[PDB]
C-alpha cells in the first residue's frame, strides 16, 4: 500500500524511498529531450522545441538560457519551475560577481542552484518557498578555470559532472546512444554533428530550423546560441 | 485496541486514557534495564549496556550522564530521546544557576523536567519523550534523593528503582536487599550482582556494565566508578554470580 | 491498514516503535557501502563511489568539513548536504569563538541534537543519512557513526549502506590489527573491506574508490583516482 | 470528492464550495431594487417576524453605509454584519483619504476584492452573503449594483435576490420599461413583485422593508418608508389590484 | 450518531462534546479517590494512598499540595496533569498577588484556572488537562470555602465534594451526612471525611494510607496534617 | 487521491490541481487577440445582457497601462484581482525605473504572480488566462498569453476560452503576412475569427485597437455595425 | 513657539436655546501671509460644530480623522452624536498619541439633541477636556479674548444679543493681535435656523 | 451530509454550516432561561437547580451585570458563558474608556455578537455553545436582545431558550402583553420557569435579575422568596 506515502514529501517508504521526489524525477520525462556533450574545445547544448503551433513565436519557448556570458543552461520539466530556478541562478552569479568580483565556477553554480533546490522540506519556507520538490532537471555547461565543464542537475538537488548527459522524454535512449557515440577526443564540430544525429534519431519529427535550439560555449568566445543561419549551416551537413 | 484514538496524544480513550503515553510505556519496557540505589551519603547508578557489535568502541552510547556537577543522569529508552532530554535538563539546570545562583535541588529539577516532558505529552504536533530517566544527587545540607520520570510525566520518589525489560524482575531481587543503612562501598556490590543477574544470557547476550555515582565519596560530585573500584565490583560480581 | 502508524514520526506503534524512524534507518541501507578504520594516530574513511552512468562522474561520498574533521555520507543527497553545511557552519563558529577545533564527540552530540528535532516534532522529515565521522582531538582518532535514528555510536569501525554486513563481518574477523596499523596497512584493510562488499564481477578501480584519511599531523585529505593510485599500488589482489 | 476546502478545483473546473455559497442565497430573504428615472429604492422581505420581535432597529435587511451609500443584505447574519462593517470602514477610509464620497463602483469593487480574497486563498469559508448596494454618484447619477458571494458584481436596473428570486426577476424583466419609471411607478412595481414572490395572499407592511434613495437640493437623502407611508403604499396597490380584477 | 468523538473542538449532533466527557472519565483513570468536607470554620481534605512497593519514597508521593501560604489544594487523575495544573495554579496565584497586592480568594483562583481550562477545551491546540481539582481556603466576611474545578473549566463551590473512582457513592454518602444539618466541627469534619472514605472503600484503613490537609480561621496557613495528628484523629475515630 | 492537492506530484508526474485550473479557462468565453504591423486587436465574445445588466461594468477587456492591454478568460473575480495587482505593479515599475513598462515585464510579473499563487496549499491558483498586448518603447508589436499554470508565451495571434481550438485552427489557416498589411486587414481577420465561434455577429463582440501609442479606444458600438457591414460586404464580395 | 508657526483664533459661545461659534479665516506661515480661506470651524452635525487651533496641517489631519471616526460612530449607532460624547471622543483622539503629541488645541460647541440645551467644551494640546458655562477661546489671542470675555459676558443672553455679543467680543479681541486676524467667520446655529455669516471687521 | 458536519469552514451543498446548528442544539439543551421586557423595565430569570445540595449555590451566579445598567443570562455551557461575560465586560469597558459614556446596549450586543462570531470564522476553534440574553435600559427604553453562537443577534419582547423552550415560548406568547408592568413581568417570568421547572422552585433554585431606569440589579434571595410566595 504505497498510497499512504506518496501523499506528502516528508514521508518515508518501508523501503526508505522518497516517493514524492521519485514522482518529481519521473516528471522530467514529460519535458522535451535535451542533450549536452562535453569536449575539450567546449560544450554544446541541443534540445527539442516541440512547437505546438506554427503561429507560435519560437523565441518565447526557451529550452536553453544564459545564466552568465561564460555559462549555459538547458531545461526539462515545468516552465515556471525552471523560470524560478534560472532567475535564482542568475541572481546568484551576480551575487558572486559582487562579493568576489570574479566569474563563479559552474560546479558552484549547480551547488547554489541545488541549494535553492532540495529546500522543499525546509522550515525556512516560512516567508514562502517550495512546499513541493522542484520539478525540472537542469543541464549546466560552460567554461571555468578547469576548462570546459558540464554538470547535470537532478530535481532532488543531486549534481554530477557528465561528459555527455541527456534529459527529457528520451533520456534513456539518447543516453544509450551517447554511450557508444562519445569519445574523449571529440572535436566541437564533430561533437555537435553527433548531437544533432542523436536528436534526429530521437526526436519525434524531422529536424528543421524550428525543431532544434542549439548552443555552444567555448573558452574563446562567450555563450553563443546558434542563429537561424548558423543552425541552417550546422543542419545542412547532416 | 483503541483504533481511531491513538493517532494523536491529545485524544482520550473511551476508557479515558491517552494511548500515546501507554505506547511510550511499552517502548520503555522494551528497552534496556538500569538500576539505581541511594546510599547513606550519596546515590549510585548502574547501566546494562548491550554491545550490539564488537565493532562498537567501549564507552559508546554512554548512558550514565550527569546533568549537573552534583546531579547524575541515568535513562532508559531511546538514545536520541535520552540525549535530547539530557540536553533540555542541562539547559534547565544552567538557567536555574544563572537566575538563582546556587545548585538545583533534585526534587525541583525533577519537577521542572517533568513539567517539560509533560509539555511534549499533551500536544498534537509533538510526541511524548518515550524514555524513562533517573535523577540522583547528594547535598550536604539537603540529603540524598532519587527520582524516576517516565514518558507518562509522573516524577515519583523511589529509594532505588529499575526500568526496562526486567522491571518486575529487578523489583523482586532489589526488594530482598536491605538499603537504607550501608553506603556506596557496600551498595556497589549489590548493584553489580543485581545487574548481572537480571540480564539474560541465552537471549540478548553481549552486555557490559558501566557504573556511576554521586556523593561525598567524591565530594558530592557525580562521576563514573573509578577503574579500580570498577574492576573490584566486577570481581565481586563474578565471585557472587559464581 | 494496520500500518496507519507509519505516516508521521509523531505516532507510536502499539508495540512501542516509531515505524517512520525505522524506515529512515533502513533508508541509509540503500546507499552505497562505506567503511572507516582508525589507527593509533590515524583514521581512514574509504567509500565506494557510484555513478549514474559510466559516461558521467561518480557520486562523491567523502566530504570535507574542516581541516581536522571529515564526514562520509550514505543516503539522501539533500539531507546529507544540509548536514554538511550545518557541520561547516558549526565548525567555523567554534573556530571563531573558541579558536579550538570542534571536538569529535561534541560535534556528534550537536549532530544528534539537531537531527532529533525532526524525529520528535511534526514537520521536517527525519534526517535519513548515515554519517561516518572521523576526526582527531586530544585523545586521538575517533570514528563516529551517526545512524539516521538520531543516534550515534563510538565505533572502532563501521560499514553503513548496501551490503554493508559483509564489511561488518570482515572487520569482525579483523579487529586484531586495526589498533597497531600504520597508514598503508589500515588503508589496505579498508580496501579489502569494500572488496568484500563489492560482488565478484566488480573490482575497486581508480574511479570506484574514494579514500579520506585524517591524523594527528595530517589533515583530513581525500584522495581520487590519481591520488588513490599510490595507495592501491600497495593493495594486494582479490582472494578469488 | 472535491467538496473539501474552497481552495480546490474540480476536474471540470468548478469551485464547488463557491457554488454552494451561491445556491445558499436561495435560503435568504427576498430583496430587490430597481432604477427609476429620478430615484432608486430597495425593497426587502422581513421573513422572520414571529410575534415578539421588538423591532428596535432602523432596518434589518437594508443597511446604510454612508451619506450616499446604502445596501440590502442576504446571507448569514454573522457574515452580513462583518460585510456591512467592512463596507463602512472602506467607504469612510476612502472619504478620509480623498475628501470625497466613495464612488459606488469603487466601493463595490473593494467589497468584491475582499470577498474574492476570502475564497481565493486561506482555507476560509467564503462570505455567503449577496448584497444589493444602492446609491448615487456624480459620475453616473443613480446606480444599483448586485453583489455576489462568489466575489462578482453587476450593474442592474432591476434585480431580486433571496428566496423565489428566479420567478421574481423573470416577471420583473417581463414588466420593466427602462428609462420611464418615476419613484411612484417603481414603488408600485416593487409592491407587485413582492405580491407575486412572497408566500402570502396579502402581504403585510410589517413583512416589507423599503428604503428609497433620492438626490434633491444638491444632497442625497436615504429614507426608509415609515409605517404610515408603507401602509398607504400597500393599500394603494391593494385597491389598484382590486381595480384591475374588477375591470377584468 | 457517533464518530464525533475525535476532536476537542468538534460539536457532535445534539451538541454533545464527547472528548470532554472522555477527559472526565480519564479523571477516574488514576484509580484513587478524594473527598473534601467543610465546617463552620474548617475545611478538611483527605485522599487515599496506594503504594505498589516499599521501594518508593512516601514523602514525595503526596497527592495534596499548597497553592499559596494559606491556600491548599488536592486533586486526582493523571499525576502528570496534576503537577502541571498545580504549577499553573501556583503561577496564577503568584501573578495575582503581584498584580493586585493581596492573596487570591479561592473562588477567584478557581474561576481563573477554570477559564484557563475552558480556553484549553475551546481551541484544538491543547489536551484539556484531564485532572480534577479541589481548592480550600479561608476568606474574610465569608469564612472557609471549598471549590472544585474540572477539565471542562466548570467550577463550583461545595459544602462537601468528592472525586475519583468512587465519585457517585461518595457524593451520596456526603448528601446523607449533610441532610442531617449538624454543625460539623473540625474534628467532626475530619471524622466525616475519614468515615466516608472507609465506608465507600470498605477497607477500614491503617492510618499510614491517608494524607490530610486542613485550613481553619485560627490557622489560616494550609496545614498538612502530619502523621502524629492524623494518627490521633483517625485512631480516635476508631475508638470514638 | 493525487488530484485534491495543489502541491503533490502524481505518480505520472502531474500537478493535477494546476491542470484543473487550466481547464477552468476552457469554460470561460472566447477571447482572441491579433498583433499587426502597427495595431493590436482584441476580439472577445460578449455575453448578451438579458434585460437589466449595465454593460459599462461587465468589462472583459481592460488596459493595464497606457502602453499595454489585456483580455481575460476565467472567473471574473480572479481577473479583477489580477488586473488590480498588475496595474499596481505597472505603476510601481514606473516608480522604480520611470520608463513605460514593456509588455515582457508586465507579462512576466503576471506569470510570476500566478505561479506564486499555485505553489502552496491554502492558495487556490488564479484560474484565468489573459492575453497581454501592447507596444514597447520602440513600438514593436508584441502579444503574450499567460496560463493559469504560471507560465507565459509569445503569440502572434491567440485565442482562449471556449472554442479556442477552433479559433486557433482558423488563425493557423488564415494568418498571413499580407493579412496584417493594413489595420483594416487585421480587423477583418479578427472579426472573422470571432464570428467563427460567435456566428450571430452584430452584438456579442467587443473590439479594441492599439496603434502606435494612441492610448487605445475600444471600438464603440457605432462602427462595430459599420465594421461588420464592411465584413459582410467583403464576405459577399469574395462570395 | 509651535503655536506661532501658523497661529489662529477660535471662540465658542452659547445663549438662550441657541449656539454661536466663531473662528478666524487667516492662513499663513509663521512669518509670511498666504491665504484667507483656512477652515478652523467644522460641522460635526446639523447643530454640532468644532473649532480647531494648532498647526494648520495638524488641524486638518485631526479634523479629517475626526470626521471619519464620527461618521463611523453615526453609522454604527444611527443616532446624532451628543456633544459630550464628541468631547470625550476628541479627547481620546488627541490623547491616543501621548508620546507623539499633535501640538493642536481644539474646541467644540453645540446643543443637547433632546432638550436643546447648548453645550460647549474646551480641549488641550495633549487632550485635557474642559467645559465652561460661559465661553471658551483657543489660538494665539487667548489672553485678550479671555480677559474681555470675562469683562463682557453675561449669563442668560438672548439669541440676537448672543450674536451681537459674540460679534463684538471676537472683533474687539482680534483687534488686539496680528498673527490671527484679517477676516473672521461667525456661525450662529439655532434649533430652527442656521444663519451662517461673516462679520465685517478690519481687513488689516 | 456527514462529510460536511465536521468543519466550520465548509458549506454544506444544500444549506449552511452544520457545526453552528450543533452548537445551537447544545444551547437548546441548557438550563431554561426566560427574559421579559416590561413597559418600564426588563426581567430575566433562570433555574439554578442541581443535585447534591452540597453544591454552594451562592458560589456561582448565572445572572451577571456587564455595567451599571446591562445584565445578561445564558443557556447552555457554563465556562463558555463565563468567557463571554469576560469578553463582554472588556468590550463594554473599552467603549466606556473611548467615549466616557455608558455603553448603549445595542452596541454591546453588536460587539459581543462580533466577538462570538469571530470564534466561528475558522476551524480548530469551536463556536461558543452558549446563547446570550441581554437586558438593558437606555434613552427611556428597555432593550432586550438575544445573542447567538452563530453571531446573530435579534431583539425580543419576551423569549425563553434552553430546555423546553418551545413550551415556554408558547406560554409567553399566550401571556405577554405590550402594556405589562415590571412586577407582573416578574410574575410571568417565574410562572414560565414554573411550567417546566420540574421540582418546586425554592428561593435559591431559581435566579432572577431585573433592570430598569435605576440600572440593573440581580434580585436578592429575600425578594426572590417574597415573589415566589406571592405567586405561590
Numbering used by the authors:
A (entry chain K): 4 to 241
B (entry chain M): 3 to 244
C (entry chain L): 2 to 241
D (entry chain I): 4 to 251
E (entry chain G): 6 to 245
F (entry chain J): 2 to 240
G (entry chain P): 2 to 205
H (entry chain H): 3 to 234
Q: What did the original publication write about this model?
A:
The 26S proteasome unfolds and degrades hundreds of proteins to maintain proteostasis, regulate cellular processes and generate peptides with second messenger functions.
In PSRpt2, Rpt2 and Rpt6 are ATP bound, while the other four subunits are bound to ADP, meaning that one hydrolysis event and one nucleotide exchange occurred during the transition from PSRpt6. Rpt2, Rpt6, Rpt3 and Rpt4 are in contact with the substrate, whereas Rpt5 and Rpt1 are disengaged. We noted a clear bias of PSRpt2 for being TXNL1-free. It is tempting to speculate that the Ins-1 conformation in PSRpt2 is less inhibitory for deubiquitination and more readily transitions to the active hairpin state that forms a β-sheet with the C terminus of ubiquitin. PSRpt2 may, therefore, represent a PS that is suited for the removal of ubiquitin chains during substrate translocation or unfolding.
